């Protein structure tokens, strides 16, 4: 069994714990987190929790459940220890550059790193690749939501006067998205001001955005999310081939599970860095290939 450690303990983290414990081919060595209180959280009962991975014995792979901005440095740090890594880095714009950066680091330390292994980027990327070669000429549209956006939500919370906030991603169709923000204000804060700060923030300025003040944001919080991917294209010279993929899932739960499968695959690769479309799909499945070929193909 692959000895694994969960690094970082947040949403994906708690879900990461469950994903690893449920894996038939993995052994959870422990959890690495910034804070370890005397009052051990219920789900962490019986689980080794430390502040540094060096305090976990013989860790072979690590799930990097830390904020996107922290992924690059964390990945390099773990790889330099010879530990395989998996993350769900979600910036489509430069994940290709992240791959280029980590590839030599991983190879030089005899480890494998699989980046952007969530559902998007991640499994949705594989789906987009399938639709692309099944019908080479055409257009694919990826429509997200209804679901909460962590990035957009954080941006709102960073605004003075905001006690808490939730930014909902709403599909407008054809790959366009609208934003529905719900904000809980600090005592005496001005809504008009906050509303402006939100609608004009570079993270919202490009999309239709609506803001609503609420008594409690936690009362509106749900981590479910979804996607509708569609493509209308040409297979060979035959037009109007229609494809549609839809998912309604628990965001952090799925992300954590995909990360687990991706780490399983990482341990099977030659040293280096990979995105999910660079790994044979069967490497994401536990155990020998034969049984899976007979069951799934």
């Amino acid at each position: 069994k692959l000895r694994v450690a969960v690094v970082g303990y947040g949403n994906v983290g708690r879900y990461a714990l469950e994903a690893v414990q449920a894996a038939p081919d993995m052994e959870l060595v422990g959890v690495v987190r910034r804070k370890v209180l005397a009052a051990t959280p219920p789900e962490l009962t019986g689980v080794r929790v430390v502040t540094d991975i060096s305090q976990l014995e013989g860790v072979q792979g690590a799930l990097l459940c830390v904020p996107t901005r922290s992924v690059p440095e964390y990945a390099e740090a773990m790889l330099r220890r010879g530990i395989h890594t998996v993350d769900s880095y979600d910036i489509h714009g430069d994940l290709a550059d992240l791959r280029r950066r980590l590839d030599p680091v991983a190879r030089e330390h005899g480890a494998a790193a699989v980046i952007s292994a969530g559902w998007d980027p991640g499994t949705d990327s594989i789906i987009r690749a399938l639709l692309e070669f099944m019908a080479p000429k055409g257009i694919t549209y990826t429509n997200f939501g209804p679901g909460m956006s962590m990035g957009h939500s954080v941006a709102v919370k960073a605004i003075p006067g905001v006690r808490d906030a939730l930014s909902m991603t709403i599909p407008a169709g054809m790959g366009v998205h609208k934003r529905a923000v719900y904000v809980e204000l600090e005592p005496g804060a001005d809504f008009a001001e906050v509303e402006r700060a939100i609608k004009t923030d570079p993270y919202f300025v490009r999309d239709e955005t609506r803001v609503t003040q609420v008594e409690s944001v936690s009362a509106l919080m749900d981590v479910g999310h979804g996607v509708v991917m569609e493509r209308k294209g040409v297979s060979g010279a035959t037009h109007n081939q229609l494809f549609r993929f839809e998912m309604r899932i628990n965001n952090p739960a799925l992300t954590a599970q995909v990360m687990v499968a991706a780490l399983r695959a990482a341990a099977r690769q030659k040293p280096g860095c990979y995105t999910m479309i660079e790994i044979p799909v069967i490497d994401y499945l536990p155990g020998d290939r034969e049984a899976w070929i007979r069951k799934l193909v």
Copy 2:
């Protein structure tokens, strides 16, 4: 460019021709077929057509567009020539055994063979694998149709008294299928007899089957088909994750296009035999990886 030959000229074959001609990284050397008449078919104008692949110059890969029962022998024959091969062998029951048989033949002759590369088996297999690792605990249902089944149709035509026939695959849900057969009888043939021969044939006996006599079967023929794949499962320890994939496509057109993508991938593999879930998805896309990673991930 990969020098390719289309072996066998039928539905998938004519669609195979178009798939290859539309590929940016391939050069169609010609078509291999059993019959070459003086009256050259319109679409084959300007295309080299011969009865043996040895008459095609420097062929590097071949699309085996022949009947399923002919695939094993054809694949071995081409592999023994050092030619990469792709087929859409559709028998789920023993394609794993086909893989075992062809693997050493391919490797011994320095070639790669990708079997069962249609949409099912094929791309649907990849999808099933994705749903499997995204939510390990649960059940996946693959529902086919409405669409014509070649195998079932042939069986009906093999029945004395049948001039022509068409067997429609109808989804009953939860992976169960019904059959709607339309038959055109020979002069003086008995419908009751044929109907019995159909409903009791081992290819129909297990499913609800209905037979209708028609004046003309060709007037009812359409090669469109489709699938609805669904899974409700557990990601980690989180239940009720919902997934759905649907496709409404031209059967032979899609199959031929996938075969083309699979042959592209074959040329990039170490010698041996592979099913589509044993190949990194990016290998199915033409050209360098970098651009695809930036566009799709």
Copy 3:
């Protein structure tokens, strides 16, 4: 305006009354029914009601709102008076023969008769014709319900021991239908007996039928109905053209409205008998053609 009479007063009849009153190009002369009591029904207040068409002045057209079995004789009777007629005769198997029977009768008396002008046969017939020429090669499926079937219901009411009942038509897909019967038994009637008489009745024997006993059938009665017509076919040489038409409507209300439109068309035809696919669609629209061409084409 066309002087019209409603002949027969039942569901379609009451709905026929409203359809005529709402027509901008028609004048309701009155209603012909076999029962005319002193206590005139509310909706018939201010409406001339008689037992014979001869007592209605200058009637030019008549809506035959009588049972299917009574249509042939009523149509001939009205046509022989020089009155245009419309009916919704619903027997697909013999309406073609009805057409040949009424054609010379209509022509000989200088009148036009449009038969089977409901939604099926009728408007659905036109739709099926369109899908047929838009994609000549393929199969069209017409799926009815959920909705009550008059014929099936009356058949059940004919069974001794049944105080009242209704038969629901349920679509099973691919043109196949199931039956859901609800029966109210007379005091002291035996359910098992009735159930058997139903499931073995020639009107039910060939379809999956379920029977449920209820305290009151009137409490379950709703005249809504619907249809889903689908076709997957070849336009020219291009396969997998997809078409779908769905309707959720009040059965008798729509039938009566279509009959009104068909009578309007009848008044514009050369004497003879027509089905709805034998009349230019614009003849079903009131007033000059020009305006409709600009509005709808």
Copy 4:
């Protein structure tokens, strides 16, 4: 069999060729096109191709597969030769005037012309007419796409600096549409400039438009299209009657097939000009009426 000629060779043209060849009641005499090079296109192998219809023997009907702006003149030219004509003229605002212009020309030369015989205008027009008389009071919405708009796409290409481009029609609901334009710029062309020229063009100014620059437009080209027609209206005096028609098809393939059916109908009409709602639907079906009535009504 009706001797037919395909005039103009483009998308609808190639599909026009297939539609005619697939028609059981027509004989393709040949194709009329502007250029006839020595290297005969594969599909035109064995087909007579000339630059003037006078060089085609005994042509009785012609499918005018030329640009919309060329239809009026081509129709008159062919009608003046006594040849029946069919076109898919798609300008809803003036086709009524086209009808009035061509009517006397057609009649004076003993020929019939059916204009605007595509799917919209054309078959969709018939559908709108049906929904109108089935429920006279209400509103019908016709929602197009996702699908490429030839007209909008040509407008973009007419702009200096654009090498190639395609305009996608996107349904916003309630008959409102948005435009998604993808453009391939000429070497050293300015995107901002082109983008402005597009969004400002009179063909786009009224609709929400988005422009994206792509490396290759041909790689995004698909001729599939679709429509969703819905009506909520009153049948007689009964409100909320619900109707819905949806289609997902190959645009030029369907258009060409409808044109073929309309030409068939043209040959059966009294001399003059007709829109598709002025012809009995059965005239669009090949052969005797009887068989179709028993089969479809």
Copy 5:
């Protein structure tokens, strides 16, 4: 049986008449309306119609089918007579205040009043309450239409130059609505002026609004309407619970039926004022509780 009177005679009124007549536990004493002409309307034949409730004998309950602005005063007037009342007051913003105003009036006179008993507010309110306690953390979206809005329509009719008009409510998703207005102008009226007066009216200024001029608005009128209520929330600590409720109905017909059920419930309550979520659902069902518990639970 509860002796009931219908107060006010309009859409909901005529539908109110039918709802009461169809109730098994009610006896219609008569209708109260401000206009009683010699030519008694057909449906009111045999029904006592007067201008004051005092002229109806032993009335125990009244359906207030009057405009929203007239509800408060009518409710107080009837309650002060000891008559139970039901209304469908639709102003979400102040109905809570209406409740506090009517509560002591109802109690003081020994009667019960159920306010805002339509489908929204009303039954939709109950649904929203259920979804709220089934999944306490999340957001519920109520999407209305396509359907005519009385308030929006009357507002447009108030604009000088407008002979008649109707405003269609269009769902844009996530609780946002657009408006589609159709207007019939008085002879010599200016469209541009009217259009501006509409789009800038406080009832339209905050929503995307489109105005179309038509020859006749009555030809576009249909009272059908609908709703789609959705919620994605957390049950306990389990996220992504999905709920969806949809309705396609005749607006005034349903409203009147709900009012009838609510009046039935009113007669069973302690004196005071209630909204529909303050009454046990079984009190809306006629007769003893036992039978309903066995039938529905």
Copy 6:
């Protein structure tokens, strides 16, 4: 805050724990369960767990999370202690008798009991009641699944030779259901035998049942479930009113949350026994009524 105890610890139990902890108006006193081992389960860390409710201080209400057959006795035992109770007893055929049995027990001990408070019976019951009074004449169909049936699954496990198994409930439409059973056999057990024992069992005999042998049942286990409730009925005298309610949820999670809401309501009722349709919906919401009325109505 209401002091609550969770009685019985299983699926609904673990979810019951979370539901109570998430309730703003409740204080979890502890959990009552049959076995309390030294190794305290992680989620029960910090939670008082005992074998008898008497060892929990000042408990005011209890969620009976025990098997259906144990509910009657447990309810009486808790009620006799003056503790309010809530259960999700799911036998539609006898819950009415349960209500009559518990009513006097509850009242005599000054407590309130709400029975059958899951989603069906429970919240679905309220929905059925709503659809019933909104459209009194018609038929409502409740279609369950895809989802695991605890009862059917237990029945299979009770069969000798089966190590483990799960029975999936499949909707066939119109309230009819099919069963899909997956069984894991004990070492050396006979499948044919087990298959017969299953399909013949009184819990399966009436429904179409399919049995499949699998290597592992736990690998197929998911507690997600769902329902589609539909009604087509008459509001007043207006037919074809259409209603549809769908839910895709975690079965035990929802059940536990509804039970929590029902216990909250129980504490607010006069002593006695109630089904969910006998309680005003607002009593299921925490805190004062005013806020909820302004927010939801």
